[PDB]
């Protein structure tokens, strides 16, 4: 329908990099057509192109990704690599044409260094200890969008030596890693996690990464792989790390296997980072900090900040995101609790007895260093009564 589509498409992808966007959404509707950038978890409408180019745009992208242009009724998935910048494409048949989703994959703005992820010193020591063990299971819990896969990616980079077979099963595979054998799931064809995980055992493996353990079938296989002499990395969506014990048991797993096989259970969430420009002090009462869980001796030296709202923060008061981490090694004391039928709260206490900081405590540490607001800590975490 027109000719300078390639200049338009190139702009939409490039501008997304300049804006440090994480995802691109190209959405056609009956009378409107829009482009949205997801930046720090929030979608902003960027472009409202003319509808005559909607089919020109999608087809230009589909050829870039080796997708069937005649198929506008079923969803398609491919990849795009541009000059050294690759994208992940997903096409979906909206009511009025195909919706396109591109996720930005630039390592340049991806941190693969555990030191730079905001782990506290004591916790990070436990995290490195478990991933460098020669076998066992390491679980990084959290929901989607909590940075949990970034913790995994940084671990694989530390382990990605040419002497070890690292296999990977994700839904979907995001970052193409060199020397790492990544498998994207496809449930319609029978390529489930268990299917790849069973195939991995037939693949002379050393390290195995699983996107998430969602059902008993996958859990059993993943644990037994960690027992057979393999390093198993995976995620679950649990509230805190102590609950991940009774999550696996509620799935139907025998407890003695959980005690023997799990080496570590990380739990983390992402919180908004205050804008460095409209940064304003908030006089929070000391009893409010104590009721939040701050040790009283350190309550006065706290200087709680917040963003007023400016242009740079798009009036959100926040810019980047920041992580609250809980790193709970499977200490001898925790193993005994699992076998005596301990509940979640009982495990939570003994972990804190042994100096295992909760996500709330990690948040109060970020608050003290002045990167997050008091509201954002209470929003994301739960107090440790």
Phi, psi of 293 (to 5 degrees): 120, 10
Site residue total, Zn ion (CB under 5 A): 7
304 is in an annotated binding site: no
Site for its own copies in 297-316 (CB under 8 A): 315-316
CB-CB neighbours of 286 under 10 Å: 12
Site for its own copies in 116-155 (CB under 8 A): 134-135, 142-146
Cβ density class 359-380: b for 16+ within 10 Å, e for less:
bbbbbbbbbbeebbbbebbeeb
- Asked whether position 186 contacts its own copies by CB under 8 A, the answer is yes
Cα of 315 vs its chain's centroid, Å = 25
Site for its own copies in 195-224 (CB under 8 A): 195-196, 198-204, 212, 214-216, 220-221, 224
- Asked whether position 101 contacts its own copies by CB under 8 A, the answer is yes
Please report how close the Cβ of residue 57 comes to its own copies at its closest, in angstroms. 16
Please report how close the Cβ of residue 228 comes to Zn ion at its closest, in angstroms. 16
The pattern of x and - marking residues 303 through 332 that bind Zn ion according to CB under 5 A reads ----x--x-xx-------------------
CB-CB neighbours of 124 under 10 Å: 16
Nearest to 135 by CA among 260, 310, 11: 260
**Whole-angstrom distance, CA of residue 115 vs CA of residue 327:** 14
Please report how close the Cβ of residue 384 comes to its own copies at its closest, in angstroms. 13
- Asked whether position 274 contacts Zn ion by CB under 5 A, the answer is no
CB 261, CB 231: distance < 8 Å: no
Nearest to 158 by CA among 184, 183, 129: 129
Nearer to Zn ion, 287 or 308 (CB): 308
310 is in an annotated binding site: yes
Q: Which does 163 bind (CB under 5 to 8 A by kind): Zn ion, its own copies, none?
A: its own copies
Q: Which does 77 bind (CB under 5 to 8 A by kind): its own copies, Zn ion, none?
A: its own copies
Question: In angstroms, what CA-CA distances link 9 with 78, 81, 250?
Answer: 16, 14, 49
CB 203, CB 167: distance < 8 Å: yes
Nearer to its own copies, 194 or 371 (CB): 194
Site for its own copies in 342-371 (CB under 8 A): none
Contact footprint for Zn ion (CB under 5 A) = 275, 277-278, 307, 310, 312-313
- Binding-site positions for Zn(2+) read 275, 278, 310, 313
């Amino acid at each position: 329908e027109d000719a300078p589509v390639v200049k338009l498409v190139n702009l939409i992808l490039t501008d997304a990099i300049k804006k440090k966007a994480s995802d691109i959404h190209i959405e056609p509707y009956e009378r409107t057509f829009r482009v949205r950038y997801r930046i720090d978890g929030v979608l902003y409408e960027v472009m409202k192109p003319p509808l005559k180019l909607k089919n020109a745009i999608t087809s230009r992208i589909k050829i870039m990704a080796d997708l069937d242009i005649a198929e506008r009724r079923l969803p398609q998935d491919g990849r795009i690599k541009i000059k050294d910048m690759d994208y992940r494409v997903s096409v979906l048949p909206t009511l009025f044409g195909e919706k396109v989703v591109l996720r930005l994959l630039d390592k340049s703005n991806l941190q693969l260094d555990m030191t730079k992820l905001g782990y506290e010193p004591t916790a990070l020591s436990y995290f490195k200890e478990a991933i460098h063990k020669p076998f066992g299971m390491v679980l990084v819990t959290g929901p989607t969008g909590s940075g949990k896969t970034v913790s995994l990616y940084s671990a694989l980079s530390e382990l990605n030596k040419t002497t070890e077979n690292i296999s990977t099963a994700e839904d979907p595979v995001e970052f193409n890693f060199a020397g790492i054998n990544q498998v994207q799931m496809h449930e319609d064809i029978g390529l489930t996690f268990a299917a790849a995980l069973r195939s991995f055992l037939r693949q002379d493996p050393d390290i195995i990464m699983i996107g998430e353990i969602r059902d008993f079938e996958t859990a059993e296989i993943a644990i037994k792989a960690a027992l057979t002499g393999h390093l198993v990395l995976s995620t679950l969506h649990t509230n805190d790390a102590p609950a991940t014990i009774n999550r696996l048991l509620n799935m139907g797993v025998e407890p003695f296997l959980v005690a023997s096989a799990v080496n570590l259970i990380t739990a983390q969430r992402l919180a908004r980072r205050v804008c460095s420009e409209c940064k304003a002090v908030e006089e929070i009462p000391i009893q409010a900090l104590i009721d939040a869980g701050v040790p009283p001796e350190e309550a006065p030296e706290y200087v709680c900040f917040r963003g007023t709202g400016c242009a740079k923060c798009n009036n959100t008061g926040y810019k980047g995101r920041v992580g609250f981490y809980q790193v709970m090694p499977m200490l001898e004391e925790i193993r005994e609790l699992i076998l005596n039928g301990a509940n979640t709260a009982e495990i939570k206490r003994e972990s804190m007895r042994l100096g295992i900081k909760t996500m709330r405590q990690s948040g109060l540490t970020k608050l003290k260093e002045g990167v997050t607001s008091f509201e954002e800590v209470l929003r994301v975490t739960v107090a440790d009564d």
